[PDB]
């Protein structure tokens, strides 16, 4: 299963499904072929495992994951959960608060899809820009709920690096250990304030938007890496580049996600982070965490 020995992409879709909701085939993220051969570049760099985030009505597909370890041996951890406001099926207002939290925990104990494969994550659990809906806090305190009876981590998503601090305050006042709560996407923006009271409270941090330079230049988010680990902080951040797009993918004349080792790694490594550092960040934070 988990490979504590290699590296860990905190947060990634391998097969994702946005189309519908878009109009758009570049957010059908579902190239089997190309996916696999993104994971074997991957595996070459020292990576074990990728983190999934795609949940069940973000077109998330266990046979997919399924596939692409058998075929690459990368190991996948698949997530549960809702995403945000805008993606919500009609039933997140419908169910109570307490059929959603026995989804999550059947995901997690008995499987996903139809499959043998079961979730290892409450994750991606979203927030709207500068807001938590009605509905959102419902699916946090689910999440909460899902996760004080199986003990299995959450993973958000905030909107442009918004609304972290009130996210964990929300989980915080459900009996959530924040340290078993990694905040997505703290990397769209200068966010430091932000980030070091996320640390401060206890919570792990991710700069999981590497790569994605029209929202917020790597150069800064260097900077900000360099920030935390100026103040001994890299035992708390996590990494990933959150492909969610066919574009994004080599072959299409994209990035890959092994972008955060062909070119973000050692542009960190070339500003002064060595590689002890590195592995912080990639290997241990995630053995500690996702397991
Ligand atoms: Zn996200
Ligand atoms: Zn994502």
């Given at each position: 299963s988990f490979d504590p020995t290699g590296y860990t992409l905190a947060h990634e879709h391998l097969h994702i499904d946005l189309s519908g909701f878009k109009?758009?085939?570049?957010?059908?993220?579902?190239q089997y072929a190309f996916i696999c051969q993104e994971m074997n570049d991957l595996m070459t760099r020292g990576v074990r495992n990728v983190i999934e985030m795609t949940n069940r009505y973000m077109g998330r597909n266990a046979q997919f994951m399924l596939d692409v370890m058998r075929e690459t041996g990368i190991n996948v951890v698949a997530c549960t959960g809702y995403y945000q406001d805008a993606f919500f099926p009609e039933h997140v207002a419908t169910r109570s608060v307490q059929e959603l939290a026995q989804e999550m925990v059947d995901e997690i104990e008995q499987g996903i899809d139809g499959t043998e494969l079961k979730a290892g994550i409450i994750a991606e659990i979203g927030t709207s820009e500068g807001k938590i809906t009605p509905l959102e806090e419902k699916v946090f305190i689910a999440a909460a709920l899902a996760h004080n009876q199986t003990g299995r981590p959450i993973s958000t998503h905030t909107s442009f690096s918004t609304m972290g601090l009130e996210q964990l305050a929300l989980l915080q006042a459900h009996g959530?250990?924040?340290?078993r709560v990694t905040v997505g996407?703290?990397?769209?923006?200068?966010?430091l304030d932000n980030i070091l009271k996320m640390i401060d409270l206890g919570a792990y941090v991710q700069?999981?938007?590497?790569?994605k330079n029209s929202y917020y230049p790597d150069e800064k988010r260097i900077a900000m890496l360099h920030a935390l680990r100026d103040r001994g902080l890299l035992n708390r951040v996590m990494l990933s580049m959150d492909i969610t797009r066919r574009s994004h993918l080599k072959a299409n004349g994209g990035y890959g996600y092994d972008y955060l080792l062909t070119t973000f790694i050692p542009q960190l490594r070339q500003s002064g982070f060595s590689q002890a550092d590195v592995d912080v960040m990639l290997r241990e934070n995630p053995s500690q965490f996702f397991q």
């Amino acid at each position: 299963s988990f490979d504590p020995t290699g590296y860990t992409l905190a947060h990634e879709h391998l097969h994702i499904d946005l189309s519908g909701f878009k109009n758009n085939v570049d957010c059908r993220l579902d190239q089997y072929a190309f996916i696999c051969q993104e994971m074997n570049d991957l595996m070459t760099r020292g990576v074990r495992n990728v983190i999934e985030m795609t949940n069940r009505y973000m077109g998330r597909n266990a046979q997919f994951m399924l596939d692409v370890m058998r075929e690459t041996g990368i190991n996948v951890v698949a997530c549960t959960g809702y995403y945000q406001d805008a993606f919500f099926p009609e039933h997140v207002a419908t169910r109570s608060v307490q059929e959603l939290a026995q989804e999550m925990v059947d995901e997690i104990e008995q499987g996903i899809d139809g499959t043998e494969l079961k979730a290892g994550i409450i994750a991606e659990i979203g927030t709207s820009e500068g807001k938590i809906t009605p509905l959102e806090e419902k699916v946090f305190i689910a999440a909460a709920l899902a996760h004080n009876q199986t003990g299995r981590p959450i993973s958000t998503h905030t909107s442009f690096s918004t609304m972290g601090l009130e996210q964990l305050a929300l989980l915080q006042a459900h009996g959530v250990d924040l340290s078993r709560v990694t905040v997505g996407h703290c990397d769209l923006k200068d966010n430091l304030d932000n980030i070091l009271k996320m640390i401060d409270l206890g919570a792990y941090v991710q700069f999981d938007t590497i790569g994605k330079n029209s929202y917020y230049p790597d150069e800064k988010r260097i900077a900000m890496l360099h920030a935390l680990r100026d103040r001994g902080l890299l035992n708390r951040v996590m990494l990933s580049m959150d492909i969610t797009r066919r574009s994004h993918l080599k072959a299409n004349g994209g990035y890959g996600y092994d972008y955060l080792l062909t070119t973000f790694i050692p542009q960190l490594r070339q500003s002064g982070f060595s590689q002890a550092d590195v592995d912080v960040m990639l290997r241990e934070n995630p053995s500690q965490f996702f397991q």
